[PDB]
């Protein structure tokens, strides 16, 4: 939930937004 999210974690959240 922080600024220092890894690139893979950023991927996952946007991927989950796209799905929903």
């Amino acid at each position: 939930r922080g600024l220092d999210l890894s690139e893979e974690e950023v991927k996952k959240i946007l991927d989950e937004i796209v799905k929903d």
Partner: antibody
Amino acid sequence: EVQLVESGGGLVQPGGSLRLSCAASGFNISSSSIHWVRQAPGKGLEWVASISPYYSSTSYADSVKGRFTISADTSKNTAYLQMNSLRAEDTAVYYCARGPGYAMDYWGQGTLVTVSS
Amino acid sequence: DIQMTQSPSSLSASVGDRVTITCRASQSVSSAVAWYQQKPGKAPKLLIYSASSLYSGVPSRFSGSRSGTDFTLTISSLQPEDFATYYCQQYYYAPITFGQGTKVEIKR
């Protein structure tokens, strides 16, 4: 119904202070990052500062450190940019945006700040 | 500090044509690159994240790719709704950097 609505811009004297705010709807600001990005007239996008409202952690572009402060209040679902020692160079449209990390997946329509005597 | 060098600064293309915008980073940003579209007088909208993933609502004609340090956004056939300015971004680490933008204008 995801929204980001900026307010607090306007015309301000050089060397003055201005506080921008960004009210968010349709999501909790502690679930993502909040970013301030500005666009001087006729120019590109320039990142200003970011915050994780959940951790309260912040980061800043070199040219605003010390004289700008980004903060957030989760109980108001709102973020802020306190701008001090304003210069002509800070004249711009200031967008608020949300997204994980430093990705910016939704942007508000921005507020115009004009710094002039 | 990461520089993002985007090219060209502007281009003119006809409707139905293929357009290619590239962004060259100063150092490795892995795949932590996004692309944004900005129409005049409006907020940018996210089109591509992690070099090659299309965001919500973005039609199948936009595509993104990476080769090492170079990043590319392609539109297969320019449609009139695609006139805008386009920006690359690295979200690898702060300070965050956007490329200078590319204004796509249609031919006539």
